[PDB]
């Protein structure tokens, strides 16, 4: 609240590692367009990433820099103009773990589905090792993607909810 | 001073932990952790508009509905993240229990959650839940669409 205006933000441990790690997270979140083809360079060699909120229940994980590089090509194909916005970066008490809350939007071109426009809200988890990403996990609202793919959305009635 | 950040963060963390540990009939009093103007609800919904439960009164009344529809609900595998803001926390966890929604067969519901908490001097201003909506469809015996991601490298 208003009496907290002068309370210092951030953490006093591992400050150089925190700065380094944060710089990488920010760099990742700011990566758009053609720079997406080199985003894998922010990762450790056996780093991984992917989608943690899926239709199967299991994460869809892309493993290792080579596969991350290949995935960037698929990503630029299916989300050609994708951009994150309303980005908020959270440091945590772990200097190697960050969370990012944001929105993201762009054209969606998945083969077998009609072209759409895709809008979603995201939480991103980043785990790092000395300035490089070990793992990035995306969490989003799966019905926003169904919409953008023109897949009918199942509706849940919550009868009696206040 | 950082000592003020530290005490605030510690007090807030205790309230977040108390919330996450609240189960059974204590769910009826979980609203006591909030400011009067406190809010809660679900930010990953079928409409894309959050289900917002505003005010301590409405939070108390929602708890009754919650205990009816999710009678044995427990959070587990709870991972609490402090942030650079002493008043903001994230919690990653799992959650599970029976689901009893009118109009659907009784089911078993498991899901993976992110919780956002914003606090003021040890009291919760806002909780926001984020989860995998498909898991709730599965629990309610609603068929889940399969999204084909042709050519995805993994």
From Swiss-Prot, chain B:
InterPro entries in alphabetical order: NTF2-like_dom_sf, PhzA_PhzB
Function: Involved in the biosynthesis of the antibiotic phenazine, a nitrogen-containing heterocyclic molecule having important roles in virulence, competition and biological control. PhzB2 (operon phzA2B2C2E2F2G2) has a role in the biosynthesis of the phenazine during both planktonic growth and biofilm development, and in host infection during biofilm development.
Subunit description: Homodimer.
Keywords: Antibiotic biosynthesis, Virulence
Similarity comment: Belongs to the PhzA/PhzB family.
Highest rank taxon of the organism: Bacteria
Protein's gene: phzB2
Triggers of expression: In liquid cultures (aerobic), phz2 operon is induced by quinolone signal via 2-heptyl-3-hydroxy-4-quinolone (PQS). In biofilm (microaerobic), phz2 operon is induced by quinolone signal via 4-hydroxy-2-heptylquinoline (HHQ), a precursor of PQS.
UniProt cross-references to Pfam families, sorted A to Z: PHZA_PHZB (PF03284)
Protein name: Phenazine biosynthesis protein PhzB2
Coiled coil: none
GO biological process: phenazine biosynthetic process
Pathway given in the UniProt record: Antibiotic biosynthesis; phenazine biosynthesis
